[PDB]
Structure 1
Amino acid sequence: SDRFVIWAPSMHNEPAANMDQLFALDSWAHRYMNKMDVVKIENCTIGSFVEHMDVATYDRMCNMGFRRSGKFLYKVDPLRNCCRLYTIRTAPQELNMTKELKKCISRFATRITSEDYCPAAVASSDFVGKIVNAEMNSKTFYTRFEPALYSEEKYHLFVKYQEKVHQDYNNSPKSFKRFLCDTPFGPEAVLGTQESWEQLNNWQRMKPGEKLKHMGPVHECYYYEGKLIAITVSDILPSGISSVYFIWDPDYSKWSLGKLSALRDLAIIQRTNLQYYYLGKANYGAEVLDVCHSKYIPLKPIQDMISRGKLFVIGKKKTKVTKELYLVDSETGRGEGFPTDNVVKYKNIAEEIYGVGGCAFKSANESALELKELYGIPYEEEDLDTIYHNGIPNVVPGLLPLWELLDIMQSGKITDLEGRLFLFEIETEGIRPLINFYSEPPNVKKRICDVIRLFGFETCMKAVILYSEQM
C-alpha cells in the first residue's frame, strides 16, 4: 500500500565487459559474425533511481527481473546487452547437492567445531541440519545480522575484498555507502526493532509456523575467532531472501565462502519459513524467470541458458505469434510458475519474436508511430532492421509491448492513472496530482509511459514520479 516514489526511468552505460557468445540470439550473431569490428556492443542498464518503496514492492520487482544497486532499481536488456543476467530463484528443498558442496559443508563443520564435536546422524544431503547443528555447537564461528549501516571495519574489509579479488582499487567510503548502505526502504525497514534482530539472529532456533518479524536490508557479518571474515549484504523479502552482494576476506580463500554463504542463506530461508532464494554454475535444480511471461520455469529443460546464456521465450509449437507477448497486469511479478505438464513440450519462440525477421520490431514501430501521431507521446520508429546501430528501445524483452500501451491509450484505460498517480517536479513548489493525462507535456507523457512499461501499470497507479526537465 506504500507509495512507490521513483525518478523517471533511464538507460545507463557502464561498458567494461569469445566474440561469438556476446549475442542474445543465434541469428543476430550469424548476421554480424564477420562485422564484429563495427558492432557497437555496450553494457546497458535500464533502471530507475528509487527514492522510496516498501519491501513488498521490491519483492514484486525481483519477481519482475529487477535487482537494486543501492537505491538504483535496474535490469539489463536481455536482447542487446553484452552480458545477459537471469533472475533465478532457488528453494532450499529443491537443491542438487553436488560432491563439492558436501566437501565444503564437511570441511566447514570440521573447522568451526572442536575435535570433541560428536556430530549427530544428520543425512549427508540435509545441508541445513549439518550447518545448524555444527554452528550451534561451535565456540569459534558465529554470524550477526545488523542494519545496513556504515562502519569502518566493514569498509576496510570491502576495500580489501575489492582490491585483492575484483582488482578494483578505485574504492571510496562514499561509493561503499552508496552501493551497500544506501537503500530505497523506510527507516523501519532499515533499522527495525531490537526484538526482530534477536529473532533473526536466533534463526537456528526458529520452529515451523513462526514468522519473521523483520523485512528489509541486512548485513550478515561472519566472525571467526573474533576477526571479521565476511559480509553478506542481502534483502529479507516476504517471499525469501535476495542476495545483493557478498564480501569475504581473501586470506580465507580456503573456505569457499561464496558457496558456504549461499548454503547458509538456504538454511535460513528454510528455518525462517521463507520459500525462495533470489540469486540474481552447471547443475542447480533451480528455476529461472521468463520475463516475457513474468513466470518461472525449471532450469533443467533450458540448457541454452546453462550453455550459452542466450535469450529464451517459452511457447507452444502449434501456436504462431504475431506480436510481443501480452503482459498480464496483476500477474507480473507474482512469482507464478508454468504448468508442470510434460505433454506440452514448450518450444523456444524467442527467435520468432526478437530474431532477425522478428514481428516484434515492425509491430513496435507501427505502434510507436501511431502513439506519437494520435496521442502526442514522443515515440519514434527505431529498429526498422539492424538492432545493432540514448533513451529506451521500443523492443525490449520483459517490458510492456508498445501495442499494449497503445491499447491502454485507445481503450481509455490510461485515464485510470489520473487521481492515483502523482507527479513531482522539484522546481514547481510542490508535488501535484495527475488531472488529465492527454493534456500533459509530451516528455511527462513519455515518462509515465516508461514507468508503465518498466514497472507495470498497477505499480504506476501507486507511484510518485520525480522529474526535472534538464535530462
Structure 2
Amino acid sequence: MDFTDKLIISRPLYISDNADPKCGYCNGKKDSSHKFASPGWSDFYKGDEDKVELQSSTVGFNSELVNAETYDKLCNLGFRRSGSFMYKTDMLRNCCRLYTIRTNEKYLTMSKELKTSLKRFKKKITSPEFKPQPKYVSWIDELCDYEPKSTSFKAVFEPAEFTDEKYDLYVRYQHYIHSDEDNTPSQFESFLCDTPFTDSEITGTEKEWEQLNNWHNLQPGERVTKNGPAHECYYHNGKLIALSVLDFLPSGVSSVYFIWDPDYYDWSLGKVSALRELALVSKIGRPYYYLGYYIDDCPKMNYKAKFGGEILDVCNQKYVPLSKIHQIIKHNELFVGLNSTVASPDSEILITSDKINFDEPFINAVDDIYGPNGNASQNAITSVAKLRKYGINYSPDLQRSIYKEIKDVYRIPNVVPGLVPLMEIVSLFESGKMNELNNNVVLFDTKINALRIVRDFISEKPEIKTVITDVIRLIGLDNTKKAIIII
C-alpha cells in the first residue's frame, strides 16, 4: 500500500455555535442588510430580523496524511487547512459569506499604493552602489534584480519546522494584532508547523531547497520541483523580521499565514510579501496565488481583492472573476451561478455528473435553489427517505427555516452548498456507482486496530456506510477512492 498516494482522514465534524463570539470576522454583528444569505431569506424575516441569532458553522475533517496534489484539489473544492484540520464554512447558514479566492500577475493591476510599497522596499534594502539595469520589462524583473544583490536583506526558504526564534516573533505579532493569549508553543506548532504532508514534501532535499532559494534567476519555462509546505524567513542584518508560511501546490502557492516584527510597521511587509509571492508564482511557472478566503464586508479579508482574481462558486465547482460578481455579493449574499439561457433550476446543481460558462450571461439563482421557497430542502428530505434502504443513517431537517430563532457533531445538514446534494448521492447508489468504492476505499478500523480495504461496501455496518457517504459529500467519489478513513 503506497501511503504517498493516500488521504488519511478522521470522520467529518459539523461544528456550529453562536457567531457572537465564535466568529472572529463579524463577532455576530451585522446590519439587517447584511444578515441573511439571500434576498428571499431577508424577505422571509422582514420586520422580524431581530429574532434570528447568527451562527458560525464549519464542516471538515482532521487529516493525518495528505499530499500536495490532493490538498490542491481540496483548496479548489473550497477547503482550507487549519494546521491538519481541513475545513470550510456552511455558506448557507454561516454569519459571514466566505469565498475561496485566487489570483496571479495577469489579474494583478499594480496600484499606486502597491507600487509605493515596492519602491520603499527597494530603498530600504538597496545600496547606493547598486547600479540599475537599463530597463525592466516588469516590476518582477526589477525585484529579481535588486533583491538578491542586497547585503542587508535576505529571505530564505526552509522546512516548515518549529524554532524558538519563530515562536517569539509570532507571539510579538499576535500581541500586536490583539491576540494577547491563546498563543502557546503548541498552538503555534500546530497552526504553522507540524503539517500533515508527506515526509518528502516536508523535508525535501538540500538540492530542492537550493533550487527554490534561487527562484529570482529562473528563466521563462523553467520550474521548481518543490511541493508541500515551507517557511520563508526574512532577515534584516541577520535578525528574523518576518515569517511567511506557504504551501506549494502543483497549481501555485497558497499563503497560510504571514507574521512580521511590529517594529517594522514602516516597511508595509504585508503588501510587500504578497507581491513577492506573486512574483514567485510567476517565476516558478505555476498559474495561481491563493490568499485563502475573501469576505466582501470584512476589511481584514477583503484587502485580498487589491491583488485581483477570481472566486470559487462551490455549487458549480468553477471560478468566476471577482469583477464580474462583486456588485451582487457586497451585501454578504450567497452567489449560485446559472447561465441566463438555462431553465430555472428545480434542484441543487449536479456536481458528480452542461457546466456553467461565466463568459456567457448568468444570474444568481440562489433563491430558486436555497431560498425559503427553493427546491433544495424538499428534494433533500425525499432523498433522506430513499437513502434509508441502503443503511444510510441520515435524518430529515424538518425546520421551516435554516436560521436559529430565539448538538450532534457528526450530523451534517441535509443541504449544504458545495457538498454533493443528497439527491445526487441517491443517484450514485441507484446507478451502482457507490460500488466503485469496493477494492478502493480503505478503513482504519479502530475496533480491530488495523487497516482493511473495503470489499463489499453495502454490507458494511450503517455507521461506517454513513461516515463514508459524508466523506463522499465533502470530497467527492473519486477522491474517496484514495482515502483511508479512520473509524
Judge same fold: TM > 0.5, yes or no.
yes
Counting only pairs closer than 5 Å after superposition, residues 387-402 of structure 1 correspond to structure 2 as 387-389=402-404, 390=408, 391-402=411-422
Kindly state the Cα deviation for residue 320 of structure 1 after the two structures are TM-superposed.
1.2
Q: Give the match for residue 298 of structure 2.
A: none
Q: Give the match for residue 323 of structure 1.
A: 347
Counting only pairs closer than 5 Å after superposition, residues 167-246 of structure 1 correspond to structure 2 as 167-246=179-258
Kindly state the Cα deviation for residue 200 of structure 1 after the two structures are TM-superposed.
0.5
Kindly state the Cα deviation for residue 384 of structure 1 after the two structures are TM-superposed.
4.6
Kindly state the Cα deviation for residue 376 of structure 1 after the two structures are TM-superposed.
2.2
Match of 2:369 among 346, 353, 356: 353
Kindly state the Cα deviation for residue 369 of structure 1 after the two structures are TM-superposed.
1.8
Q: Give the match for residue 318 of structure 2.
A: 295
Contact 1:424–1:430 (CA under 8 A) maintained in structure 2: yes
- Whole-Å separation in 1 of the counterparts to 2:223 and 2:197: 21
Counting only pairs closer than 5 Å after superposition, residues 413-428 of structure 1 correspond to structure 2 as 413-428=433-448
Kindly state the Cα deviation for residue 42 of structure 1 after the two structures are TM-superposed.
2.0
Gaps of 5+ in 2: 293-302
Aligned length: 457
- Whole-Å separation in 2 of the counterparts to 1:103 and 1:395: 46
- Whole-Å separation in 2 of the counterparts to 1:106 and 1:241: 24
Kindly state the Cα deviation for residue 423 of structure 1 after the two structures are TM-superposed.
1.2
Amino acid at match of 2:7: F
Q: Give the match for residue 57 of structure 1.
A: 70
> Is residue 2:363 matched to residue 1:363?
no
TM-score by length of 1: 0.92
Contact 2:60–2:88 (CA under 8 A) maintained in structure 1: yes
Amino acid at match of 1:119: P
Structure 1 SS opposite 2:55: coil
Amino acid at match of 2:200: E
Q: Give the match for residue 48 of structure 1.
A: 61
Choose 138-147 or 22-31, whichever is displaced more: 22-31
> Is residue 2:21 matched to residue 1:9?
no
Contact 2:241–2:260 (CA under 8 A) maintained in structure 1: yes
Kindly state the Cα deviation for residue 304 of structure 1 after the two structures are TM-superposed.
3.8
Structure 2 SS opposite 1:378: coil
Amino acid at match of 1:437: F
Contact 1:105–1:130 (CA under 8 A) maintained in structure 2: no
Contact 1:305–1:311 (CA under 8 A) maintained in structure 2: no
- Whole-Å separation in 2 of the counterparts to 1:3 and 1:293: 26
Contact 1:143–1:223 (CA under 8 A) maintained in structure 2: yes
Kindly state the Cα deviation for residue 365 of structure 1 after the two structures are TM-superposed.
1.1
Contact 2:316–2:356 (CA under 8 A) maintained in structure 1: no
Q: Give the match for residue 39 of structure 1.
A: 52
- Whole-Å separation in 1 of the counterparts to 2:358 and 2:428: 32
Deviations 1:240-283 (A, max 9, x none): 00111111111111122111111110100111111110111355
- Whole-Å separation in 2 of the counterparts to 1:431 and 1:10: 22
Amino acid at match of 1:377: I
Q: Residues 97 and 306 from structure 1, CA distance in 2 versus in 1: closer, same or farther, beyond 3 angstroms?
A: farther
- Whole-Å separation in 1 of the counterparts to 2:463 and 2:358: 44
Q: Give the match for residue 405 of structure 1.
A: 425
Structure 1 SS opposite 2:53: coil
Kindly state the Cα deviation for residue 286 of structure 1 after the two structures are TM-superposed.
0.8
Amino acid at match of 1:312: F
Amino acid at match of 1:4: L
Counting only pairs closer than 5 Å after superposition, residues 61-460 of structure 1 correspond to structure 2 as 61-122=74-135, 126-280=138-292, 281=303, 283-304=306-327, 307-318=330-341, 319-328=343-352, 339=357, 341=359, 344-372=360-388, 374-389=389-404, 390=408, 391-460=411-480
Contact 1:13–1:44 (CA under 8 A) maintained in structure 2: yes
Kindly state the Cα deviation for residue 413 of structure 1 after the two structures are TM-superposed.
1.2
Amino acid at match of 2:238: G
Q: Residues 404 and 353 from structure 1, CA distance in 2 versus in 1: closer, same or farther, beyond 3 angstroms?
A: same
Amino acid at match of 2:288: Y
- In angstroms, what is the RMSD of aligned CA positions? 2.0
Contact 1:361–1:395 (CA under 8 A) maintained in structure 2: yes
Deviations 1:323-354 (A, max 9, x none): 1000036x9xxxxx96464xx31111112111
Amino acid at match of 1:370: K
Amino acid at match of 1:326: L
> Is residue 2:482 matched to residue 1:462?
yes
Percent identity between the two aligned chains: 44
Structure 2 SS opposite 1:424: strand
Amino acid at match of 1:8: R
Kindly state the Cα deviation for residue 404 of structure 1 after the two structures are TM-superposed.
0.7
TM-score by length of 2: 0.89
Kindly state the Cα deviation for residue 105 of structure 1 after the two structures are TM-superposed.
0.9
Contact 1:419–1:435 (CA under 8 A) maintained in structure 2: yes
Q: Residues 126 and 29 from structure 1, CA distance in 2 versus in 1: closer, same or farther, beyond 3 angstroms?
A: farther
Contact 2:337–2:356 (CA under 8 A) maintained in structure 1: no
Amino acid at match of 2:166: K
Kindly state the Cα deviation for residue 437 of structure 1 after the two structures are TM-superposed.
2.0
Q: Residues 382 and 13 from structure 1, CA distance in 2 versus in 1: closer, same or farther, beyond 3 angstroms?
A: closer
Choose 193-202 or 381-390, whichever is displaced more: 381-390
Choose 206-215 or 105-114, whichever is displaced more: 206-215
Structure 1 SS opposite 2:324: coil
Q: Give the match for residue 334 of structure 1.
A: none
Contact 2:329–2:335 (CA under 8 A) maintained in structure 1: no
Deviations 1:360-405 (A, max 9, x none): 1111111112212x22211121055201134211111111010110
Contact 2:155–2:232 (CA under 8 A) maintained in structure 1: yes
Amino acid at match of 1:358: G
